[PDB]
Design a protein around this ligand. Structure first.
Ligand SMILES: Nc1nc2c(ncn2[C@@H]2O[C@H](COP(=O)(O)OP(=O)(O)OP(=O)(O)O)[C@@H](O)[C@H]2O)c(=O)[nH]1
Ligand SMILES: CN[C@@H]1CCc2c(ccc(O)c2O)[C@H]1O
Lengths: 56, 236, 287, 334
């Protein structure tokens, strides 16, 4: 079971060398995507009953 | 046009099949068999088996269909496979009553902890438990002129006395009766602590030779269903 | 004088309103929610429907007849009113008998309850009960087989403003036997068996576990047998006695006991709908 | 020397935590504060599907947003038709316990598994068993069709695998989890997938490389469900402590948490919308809740089920949302 321990160390070593970006840029990207695709969400915007397939 | 008729015909056939299957679904009764390791769970099923990742066993008693589902191959200290068993009629618990000396901690203490965890589970609040206390004659041999004593492993035995309502089997010394009733009361204390009147326990004493295990289970299931019906109408 | 006639209208209207409201609330609560759609709940639905029909049909007309002291409708309408009374009264008891039998089967036959009772069979039973109840009301009242023979009855029949209850011995015995006496022994036997089973189970539990750890059975059985017995017992005795020998029971006592029988209508929802699911349903709407 | 290795591991965790903390320039709520809220949202039931004799655990919408599949504990899979609320198929099972179901992207194959450690696949158009995949040592929890000729599965033995339908033999096995794995989700491009284990940890895997890339340990209890952002650079998880957290692949830490003080029940399902603005999560309180992704503000409640909700899904076109409950009823909300 001690043999296991070196394998863990390699995994943490490989998972620590990752380039990261500031959270502000990621929040801005999420904001931009949500704003851009905000006009094509039937759940968000109540569509007229003419195009609604579940209106009986 | 004909597509609607074809879909209606398919729906009618499916409804007929479901209506046919509903009766056989409601007819059968489902039981769960859980035990700790070294219990004897395996020996008990085959005698029941000899008579009429998972294991299923079918046996009919007085034109009533019972189905038993051993869960095995998944040894988990934490069980998440237990949320699926809230609709079973009863739970069969098998414990090795003669193994209080065997050290893994103790086996009997581990079985008691498992029973306590099962009893207080959130999804099993309305499920009764049938208890089988296996290995009767091993316990008798250990108690009668045995070097090992219950006093060393279980200290509160010392203050325990034989109940006045006990009915000891003929031809046995008082010592084995005391040990058996002490273990049964040890289980019944946890059974009673949080009973709340919704589900009970049915202790029993058995051995490899006994063939009455089939009749007992039937009687206990009938009693459980009758008690549930009585409580539903506010009569108990 | 006027003040005394002035008073009973308020209480009679309150009785009518309570009778209507209770059964309409039970009916809408059962219909609205799909979780209460149970086999044992169909008999209660039939009972509520019959009780609501009776409370909306016979009670106001009897109130108007008592207050006005003169029947201002036609003879056909009075006969229809009497038929409605007989039909509803007969149908309001056999449903209780069916409920008692269903509980007996559920408790004493736990392994065969599911197979014996089916949603299709309950409808057949309900229609059979309703058709036998309507066979003993409309069929012998539209025809003149119930009519008496003495001169007072004929004089009242001739007049278009008088219609009381006059009948011979045969109908007065047959209707009572069909409506009340027969569905009584069955209920008594069923509830005695249920009480015996409950006592046996309680004794078994006490013997098995009582060291670490009656009043309940009696109370439920009691609030069930006594309400119905006290409500419907005296009337179905005076019905026989005043016919078996005349000049014993005055009209006032007969009417008073008959109206005492009607008060049983407002108690069935308070007895058969006390389950926690019903409380949740009642709290869900109009609360 | 084991203690020295443990010391080296302890040191690495601190460096990773410091690196994650160094990137916390500003909170998500601070950035998204001037956006007008979407306001209250209201939904009403449009269809109700009946025919299941027992409780329902899983369901999966079709690729055409018309058909759907559902599996119950009576031992049956039923393929519905939401437009005409009528059934098309009813497949019996050898084992009556099923915990997951899936629908092929091409609409040709259907798979399901349960307590028995076997994943079975049915050919819809030929309905008989086509292939049985075995080799797992624990109960299956979730499975998803990566394509028409290969499937990815997770089981209760702390592993995930990528099967091959034609051969029936395991191709790549992912290890590293400590507790049972209950859910997984795939990226739209089918290059990476995430898994949520019972040790309060979520990981990001590589299908082709067969190695782990990142590890997220935001939660403190069991993780039951997981969903993936439409953009492809975020995902959300739901745990037993009545909390939902939105993580981030590029930032490598959580950004927002969803919780309220009046709920103490568990969470069983999580899903997004087409635009990603709405977070839909099912609870153990017999109903559903609709959150706001960029504001953590409640915007609606989906009630109508008499028992706990154990399934949730949104169609590809995003026109309706369907929920499953232990009351043996399926509902369509719009
Ligand atoms: N004296 C006695 N010995 C028994 C009895 N039942 C079983 N044994 C013995 O104890 C053993 C334990 O039962 P097993 O056959 O191992 O059953 P199992 O299902 O593998 O046991 P678990 O590990 O508890 O799941 C049996 O194989 C027998 O050797 C019994 O009634 N009396
Ligand atoms: C005057 N009203 C009637 C009189 C006779 C009668 C009633 C009810 C049930 C019966 O079996 C009867 O015979 C009463 O409702």
């Amino acid at each position: 079971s001690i043999a296991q321990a070196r394998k863990l160390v390699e995994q943490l070593k490989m998972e620590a060398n990752i380039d990261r970006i500031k959270v502000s840029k990621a929040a801005a990207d999420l904001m931009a995507y949500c704003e851009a695709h905000a006009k094509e969400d039937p759940l968000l915007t109540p569509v007229p009953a003419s195009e609604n397939p579940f209106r009986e | 046009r004909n597509e609607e008729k074809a879909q209606r015909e398919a729906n009618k056939k499916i409804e007929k099949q479901l209506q046919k299957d509903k009766q056989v679904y409601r007819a059968t009764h489902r039981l769960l068999l859980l035990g700790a390791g070294e219990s004897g769970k395996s020996t008990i099923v085959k005698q029941m088996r000899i008579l009429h990742g998972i294991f299923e066993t079918k046996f009919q008693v007085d034109k009533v269909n019972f189905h038993m589902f051993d869960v095995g191959g998944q040894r988990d200290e934490r069980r998440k496979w237990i949320q699926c068993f809230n609709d079973v009629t009863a739970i069969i618990f098998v414990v090795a009553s003669s193994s209080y000396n065997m050290v893994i901690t103790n086996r009997l203490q581990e079985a008691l902890n498992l029973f306590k965890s099962i009893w207080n589970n959130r999804w099993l609040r309305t499920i009764s438990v049938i208890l089988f206390l296996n290995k009767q004659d091993l316990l008798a041999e250990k108690v009668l002129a045995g070097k090992s004593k219950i006093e060393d492993y279980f200290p509160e035995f010392a203050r325990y006395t034989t109940p006045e309502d006990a009915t000891p089997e003929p031809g046995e010394d008082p010592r084995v009766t005391r040990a058996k009733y002490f273990i049964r009361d040890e289980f019944l204390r946890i059974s009673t602590a949080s009973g709340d009147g919704r589900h009970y326990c049915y202790p029993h004493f058995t051995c490899a030779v006994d063939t009455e295990n089939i009749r007992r289970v039937f009687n206990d299931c009938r009693d459980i269903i009758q008690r549930m019906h009585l409580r539903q109408y506010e009569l108990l | 004088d006027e003040v005394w006639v002035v008073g009973m209208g308020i209480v009679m209207s309150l009785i009518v309103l309570a009778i209507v409201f209770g059964n309409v609330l039970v009916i809408t609560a059962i219909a609205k929610f799909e979780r209460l759609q149970t086999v044992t709940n169909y008999f209660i639905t039939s009972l509520a429907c019959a009780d609501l029909v009776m409370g909306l049909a016979v009670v106001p007309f009897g109130a108007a007849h008592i207050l006005t002291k003169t029947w201002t409708f036609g003879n056909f309408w009075c006969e229809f009113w009497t038929s409605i009374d007989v039909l509803c009264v007969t149908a309001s008891i056999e449903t209780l008998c069916v409920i008692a039998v269903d509980r007996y089967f559920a408790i004493t036959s736990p392994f065969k309850y599911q197979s014996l009772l089916t949603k299709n069979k309950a409808r057949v039973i309900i229609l059979m009960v309703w058709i036998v109840s309507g066979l003993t009301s409309f069929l012998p009242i539209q025809m003149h087989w119930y009519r008496a023979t003495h001169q007072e009855a004929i004089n009242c029949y001739a007049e278009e403003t008088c219609c009381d209850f006059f009948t011979n011995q045969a109908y007065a015995i047959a209707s009572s036997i069909v409506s009340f006496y027969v569905p009584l022994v069955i209920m008594v036997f069923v509830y005695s068996r249920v009480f015996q089973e409950a006592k046996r189970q309680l004794q078994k539990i006490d013997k098995s576990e009582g060291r670490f750890h009656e009043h309940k059975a009696l109370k439920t059985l009691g609030i069930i047998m006594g309400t119905f017995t006290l409500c419907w017992l005296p009337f179905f005795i005076v019905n026989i006695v005043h016919v078996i020998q005349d000049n014993l029971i005055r009209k006032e006592v007969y009417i008073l006991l008959n109206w005492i029988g009607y008060v049983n209508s407002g108690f069935n929802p308070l007895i058969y709908c006390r389950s926690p699911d019903f409380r949740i349903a009642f709290q869900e709407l109009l609360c | 020397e084991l203690d020295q290795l443990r010391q080296e591991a302890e040191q690495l965790k601190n460096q990773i935590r410091d690196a994650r903390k160094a990137c916390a320039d500003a909170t998500l709520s601070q950035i998204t504060n001037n956006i007008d809220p979407v306001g209250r949202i209201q939904m009403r039931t449009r269809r109700t599907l009946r025919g299941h004799l027992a409780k329902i655990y899983a369901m999966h919408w079709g690729t055409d947003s018309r058909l759907l599949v559902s599996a119950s504990q009576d031992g049956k899979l039923i393929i519905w038709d939401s437009y005409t609320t009528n059934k098309v198929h009813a497949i019996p099972l050898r084992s009556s316990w099923v915990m997951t179901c899936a629908y092929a992207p091409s609409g040709n194959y259907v798979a399901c598994g349960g307590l028995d450690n076997i994943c079975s696949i049915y050919n819809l158009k030929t309905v008989r068993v086509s292939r049985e995949l075995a080799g797992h040592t624990g109960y299956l929890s979730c499975c998803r069709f990566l394509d028409d000729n290969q499937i990815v599965t997770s089981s209760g033995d702390t592993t995930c695998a990528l099967w091959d339908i034609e051969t029936g033999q395991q191709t790549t096995t992912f290890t590293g989890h400590t507790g049972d794995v209950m859910s997984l989700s795939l990226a739209p491009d089918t290059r990476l997938f995430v898994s949520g284990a019972c040790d309060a940890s979520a990981k990001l895997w590589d299908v082709r490389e067969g190695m782990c890339r990142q590890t997220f340990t935001g939660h403190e209890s069991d993780i039951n469900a997981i969903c993936f952002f439409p953009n492809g650079n975020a995902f959300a998880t739901g745990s037993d402590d009545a909390t939902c957290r939105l993580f981030d692949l590029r930032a490598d830490q959580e950004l927002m948490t969803y919780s309220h003080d009046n709920i103490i029940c568990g969470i069983t399902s999580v899903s997004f919308s087409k635009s990603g603005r709405l977070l839909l999560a099912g609870y153990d309180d017999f109903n559903c809740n609709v959150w706001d992704a960029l504001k953590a503000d409640r915007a609606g409640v989906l009630a109508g089920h008499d028992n706990r909700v154990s399934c949730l899904g949104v169609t590809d076109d995003g026109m309706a949302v369907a929920t499953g409950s232990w009351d043996s009823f399926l509902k369509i909300w719009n």
